[PDB]
Amino acid sequence: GARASVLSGGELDKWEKIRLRPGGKKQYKLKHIVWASRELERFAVNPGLLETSEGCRQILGQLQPSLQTGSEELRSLYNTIAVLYCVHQRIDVKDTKEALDKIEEEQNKSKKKAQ
Amino acid sequence: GARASVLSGGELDKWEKIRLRPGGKKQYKLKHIVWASRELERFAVNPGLLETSEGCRQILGQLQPSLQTGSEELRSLYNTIAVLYCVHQRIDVKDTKEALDKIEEEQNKSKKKAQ
Amino acid sequence: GARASVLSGGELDKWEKIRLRPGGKKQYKLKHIVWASRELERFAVNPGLLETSEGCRQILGQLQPSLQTGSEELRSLYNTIAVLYCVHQRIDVKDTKEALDKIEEEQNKSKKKAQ
Amino acid sequence: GARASVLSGGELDKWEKIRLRPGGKKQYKLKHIVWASRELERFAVNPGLLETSEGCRQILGQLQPSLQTGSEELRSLYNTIAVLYCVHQRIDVKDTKEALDKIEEEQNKSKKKAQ
Amino acid sequence: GARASVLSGGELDKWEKIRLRPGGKKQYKLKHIVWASRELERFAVNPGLLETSEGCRQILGQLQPSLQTGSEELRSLYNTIAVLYCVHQRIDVKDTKEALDKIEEEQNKSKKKAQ
Amino acid sequence: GARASVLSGGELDKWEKIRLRPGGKKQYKLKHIVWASRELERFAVNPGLLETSEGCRQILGQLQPSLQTGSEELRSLYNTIAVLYCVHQRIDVKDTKEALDKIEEEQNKSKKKAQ
Ligand SMILES: *C(=O)CCCCCCCCCCCCC
Ligand SMILES: *C(=O)CCCCCCCCCCCCC
Ligand SMILES: *C(=O)CCCCCCCCCCCCC
Ligand SMILES: *C(=O)CCCCCCCCCCCCC
Ligand SMILES: *C(=O)CCCCCCCCCCCCC
Ligand SMILES: *C(=O)CCCCCCCCCCCCC
């Protein structure tokens, strides 16, 4: 079933246009997704939620408290999830940062109706 | 000290008569506790908390926030503990859902003590 | 660089005088720091937080809710960091119990400026 | 004519992506469909009713009261039908519980504006 | 746990002392429970319900509308369950007919208390 | 992503149909594009900015005060960037003159609300 987002014009295709870091020639591979899937099993975070935007949304919210203190792999994973989230939401980034930006702002939009 | 628990009418005797799932044929076994002991150690949690209702009430509180995100193994563990809790409280549960019902009833009760 | 580890009146010179138990004849060692660094890495935490008081403060903040149900290793990990915190802050402690006393006294400072 | 529904975007394609329970890797199978047909014949329910959401709806109305005391295979049959029902309405669940919540919403709400 | 079936005054001690008919010399035998166990599996009814008076109470309600046009095997099952209910409730019924009288008296307690 | 510019109905299709000059005998060749891209790496301009109209717009405004004293390769490149902008915006010119007009208009459209 995972192969349905793996299409050209889909999420994996877009993923490989998204840089790990904004000025690089290199984009995230499929293997970071696999790796991330496994790591989330290691954190007891269920991988199917990865095809579900709100489940990811909450995961990012659950994770934010741990990013300040967590490992570089956790930050790489957070950024991987953050990009996958914007990718599943069909919002367009050339790189990692823009997603972070979109998130915090989505969270600011959440803050505005958090009152 | 394990030999204190193997008496007829004890916690293990009740344990082996409790259904894993509401409609489940099979019953809880000791290996679920052993597996759970190992898991809590993997989570840097005291496995000895599985022997008391104060301990179990606290573990269930610790694990509950991770259930939405969790794996079957974790849910099966949580459920195993809800049953252990009910057994330590001498509540004669016959399955997992009923044990779980009891836990959330106890939460409604603690709410009554904290209005 | 190496001269720093044979420094007189330095942090390691103080560390080896601190007792494991209040009256005891056994003192803190370098291998406890090595173990704690490896464990934090195992727990998906940035080990770079051990070098300063503020990184350690974040770790102790992180560990405090987990103490209630924590393993003996997790409590040992907390206790080790608390003694190091005291060394970093230049608090003169002779044993583990005194380090815990000093830590609880430092935590009452934010209470003092609550009005 | 069952094959008309095993095409991509159809019943089987979605069926194989729906979890048997909210938490696990085991997803629904075609052999379960061939079974569901046999089980409805066991209850004198015409399997051709599974091709219409209204057939299924009235059946679920028929069928739900027997689940409190009946088999785990019967609960599976109800849930299997609830998913086939959802396939026709194209309610997008990832799992069975979400279907059950959607079913008891479908068997409720209209209740308030039907009374 | 075997010692429960040969307990003086236990449920099976009572079972074997309850007459199959009021004028008759025949008493309920364990094999009626066994025979009933195949029948409950055949009717897709959970066998664990006959270990408890509430599960039995609910089954007797479920069977109640269906008895007027039923089979001898089914009536023999209903009557077997009515005796098991009475035994589980610790009602010292001496025959099948008394177990039925007790079921209809118990059904009237909540009628007496209807308003 | 240079290969995205290779779409039929896309940028290369249009480039090969766009005269290099208002009445130019030669039309765009992919080698000028490689070279152009490279040249922008020479000028500290990220090539990913040439895969978007926003990138090209920002580049032209920056470059613009320096256009009067720049090189013929840079002016050919400037008019190419102007065209890259126009093809990304799906604006149809057959030569570069119209693009100039559109750009001054974009500069004038941009300045029209600047009050
Ligand atoms: C459904 O596609 C079942 C097969 C799952 C394994 C596919 C392996 C290759 C693609 C992995 C994509 C992971 C991210 C969506
Ligand atoms: C505390 O009891 C120490 C550890 C005991 C190990 C398990 C013993 C379980 C009971 C055995 C009873 C054998 C009777 C023949
Ligand atoms: C660091 O303090 C500067 C010197 C780094 C080069 C190696 C020094 C070797 C001598 C160290 C002291 C004696 C051995 C522990
Ligand atoms: C339909 O045209 C009637 C003739 C029989 C068609 C069989 C198609 C089998 C498809 C896979 C199994 C479906 C099980 C419900
Ligand atoms: C449950 O109560 C535990 C029962 C343990 C065994 C009791 C002794 C059984 C003796 C059987 C003797 C042979 C009978 C044919
Ligand atoms: C995006 O396509 C970058 C990765 C592929 C590069 C090789 C194919 C390039 C085809 C067009 C020629 C280059 C023009 C700048």
Author numbering:
A (entry chain X), B (entry chain W), C (entry chain V), D (entry chain a), E (entry chain Y), F (entry chain U): 1 to 115
Mind quoting what the paper says about this structure?
During virus assembly, a primary role of the MA domain is to bring Gag to the inner leaflet (IL) of the plasma membrane via its covalently attached N-terminal myristate group and highly basic region (HBR). The MA HBR promotes Gag membrane binding by engaging in electrostatic interactions with the IL of the plasma membrane. The HIV-1 MA protein forms trimers that assemble into a hexameric lattice with central cavities at points of sixfold symmetry on PS- and PI(4,5)P2-enriched membranes. During HIV-1 maturation, the MA lattice undergoes structural rearrangement, with mature virions displaying a more regular hexameric lattice and smaller central hexameric apertures compared to their immature counterparts.
